[PDB]
């Protein structure tokens, strides 16, 4: 398990979804991601994992109406193809239908500020990207009250790894208590589904467990 | 998905300058992740990786011979370009042209060209 | 800057048989490293992309591994069109380096 991929649930870090530990080993070959991207500001996203104590997650409510939300992939192979464990990949339920302008909000409920991860897909061509997500222009945007940000696929063939010249880039966002982050796209959006939460910032209502230190060792344990 | 086919004049005299064009095909040169290479290889010896060009104007040059070379993109033709000043028969090489995909998960910026075009051969001679 | 050590630098195998070329960079360099092909006079391809990954088009007798300061790419059954010599490429800073190339030739 890469440390970023508990967020985000690749086939590997399927045991560690909501782990709680009061100290984290980082282990060498681990891979963060089952489908290749990148997460923006990736090094300082994981220090906050390292400190969390854990993470428990509770999911966001999202729900959909016309649309695929079960793509799958040859990367995430889990038993049959699959997907990141926490969000869901959203197709336009007919090659090359047209993605429809959709709207989501979440507010964040709980007294500790949620972690919120999203998904911009870059098709692996330009044909691709019209099979998904039907044709013409592509804009999607994330909007909370501290945050926002607008992302288009910009879609071409990439160097293939894991079988894909496609890639996912994921975007993360911090969310105070009482907050809400709108979520507005055309299509090329990859959606969470679940919200993480960090146990260091629980009520002391036994899910909590504070402060851990990450670390990095090629060591076994003892 | 993209071909690339290098173009020059084959024999440049010695202190002139080089001059090479890579004509592009299947892909416009004004895209935003793609990356514009050359690469040489003089007869019996090692690759040389020369540098890159982004349509937004990052550029990145051989320190070994950043103080001679430049690269540009002509949108209009869809061509990118090499010149290669003050020459020497160290110079004499195949020169080959190459996209990449800017990858910052998996390879530094502009660091990995994964589509060449076959090269051509430039011979620095009087 | 970093110096890429291929080795050997020429080899001799029958077709059928399993080939191995090693590239040791001189610094560790992760998983940024690159095995190219070359044919003669054809454009020189990409076999395989950050140490494991095979290219499109490539067949699957190809694999590239290792990490580190050691990377391997093995030919498991030599075919008589895999005659070309073969480079490893660094990505992992600026400039990118290349070995000085393994030629691989057939014996029939």
């Known amino acids: 398990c890469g440390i970023l991929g508990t967020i985000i649930g690749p086939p590997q870090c399927d045991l560690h979804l909501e782990f709680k530990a009061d100290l984290i080993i980082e282990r060498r070959n681990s891979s963060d991601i089952c489908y290749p991207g990148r997460f923006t500001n990736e090094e300082a996203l994981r220090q906050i994992i390292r400190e969390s104590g854990g993470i428990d997650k509770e999911s966001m409510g999202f729900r959909y109406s016309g649309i695929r939300t079960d793509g799958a992939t040859s990367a995430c192979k889990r038993t049959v193809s699959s997907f990141y464990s926490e969000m869901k990949w959203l197709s336009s339920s007919m090659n090359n239908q047209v993605f429809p302008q959709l709207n989501q909000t979440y507010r964040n409920t709980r007294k500790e500020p949620a972690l919120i991860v999203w998904g911009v897909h870059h098709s692996s061509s330009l044909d691709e990207q019209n099979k998904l997500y039907g044709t013409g222009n592509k804009l999607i945007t994330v909007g909370s009250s501290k945050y926002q940000q607008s992302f288009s696929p910009s879609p071409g063939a990439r160097p293939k790894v894991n079988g894909q010249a496609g890639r996912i880039d994921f975007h993360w966002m911090l969310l105070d208590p009482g907050d809400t982050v709108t979520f507005t796209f055309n299509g090329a959006f990859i959606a969470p589904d679940r919200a993480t939460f960090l146990r260091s910032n629980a009520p002391s209502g036994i899910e909590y467990n504070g402060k851990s230190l990450g670390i990095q060792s090629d060591a076994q344990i003892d | 998905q993209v071909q690339l086919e290098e173009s020059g004049p084959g024999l440049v005299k010695p202190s002139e300058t080089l001059s090479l064009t890579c004509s592009v095909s299947?892909?416009?040169?004004?895209?935003?992740?793609?990356?514009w290479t050359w690469i040489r290889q003089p007869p019996g010896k090692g690759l040389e990786w020369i540098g890159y060009?982004?349509?937004?104007?990052?550029?990145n040059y051989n320190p070994s011979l950043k103080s001679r070379v430049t690269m540009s993109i002509d949108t209009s033709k869809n061509e990118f370009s090499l010149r290669l000043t003050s020459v020497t028969a160290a110079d004499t090489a195949v020169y080959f042209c190459?996209?990449?995909?800017?990858?910052?998960?998996?390879?530094?910026?502009?660091?990995?060209?994964?589509?060449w075009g076959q090269g051509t051969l430039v011979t620095v001679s009087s | 800057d970093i110096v890429m050590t291929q080795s050997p630098s020429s080899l001799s195998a029958s077709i059928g048989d399993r080939v191995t070329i090693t590239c040791r960079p001189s610094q560790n360099i992760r998983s940024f490293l690159n095995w190219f092909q070359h044919k003669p006079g054809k454009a020189p391809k990409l076999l395989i992309y950050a140490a494991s990954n095979l290219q499109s088009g490539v067949p699957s007798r190809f694999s590239g591994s290792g990490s580190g300061t050691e990377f391997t790419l093995t030919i498991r059954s030599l075919q008589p069109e895999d005659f070309a010599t073969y480079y490893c490429?660094?990505?992992?800073?600026?400039?990118?380096?290349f070995g000085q190339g393994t030629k691989v030739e057939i014996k029939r």
């Open positions: 190459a996209r990449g995909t800017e990858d910052l998960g998996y390879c530094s910026s502009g660091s990995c060209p994964n589509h």
């Open positions: 299947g892909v416009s040169v004004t895209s935003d992740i793609y990356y």
């Open positions: 060009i982004f349509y937004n104007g990052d550029t």
């Open positions: 490429q660094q990505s992992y800073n600026t400039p990118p380096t």
